[PDB]
Structure 1
């Protein structure tokens, strides 16, 4: 819900099918993806932090639920 679907490496490993005519200019698409890649790289740390906090959030909530059940023995 909150973390990125794609990573920098998904973007810079991506290639597209080629068409004989009326496709998009390759130099223009590649230059645009150059900047997109740079943005994903810049976001990597913050996205790693949101994933780590999310998984730890889930683990804390689960242990809290388990222990609250234990004290209600």
Structure 2
């Protein structure tokens, strides 16, 4: 299926306030790393598609 979130969306996500909700620093630092993972995967899919496209064109 398609990807729900961009790395932009991950970063822009705001959460409402809740008394005794999750520690904001823990969630924020966690999503900081999740952002890096979205960027890596998005770039990895692009390079793989580019490799396929080059190989198909080679095959031609």
Report the TM-score, using the length of structure 2 for normalisation: 0.67
Structure 1 unaligned residues grouped into runs of 5+: 51-73
Where in structure 1 do 4 or more consecutive aligned residues deviate above 3 Å? Answer: 46-50
Q: Does 1:30 align with 2:42?
A: no
Greater C-alpha radius of gyration:
1
CA RMSD of aligned residues (A): 2.3
Contact 1:8–1:40 (CA<8 Å) still a contact in 2?
yes
Structure 2 unaligned residues grouped into runs of 5+: 49-60
Report the TM-score, using the length of structure 1 for normalisation: 0.57
Q: How far off its partner does 1:10 sit?
A: 0.5
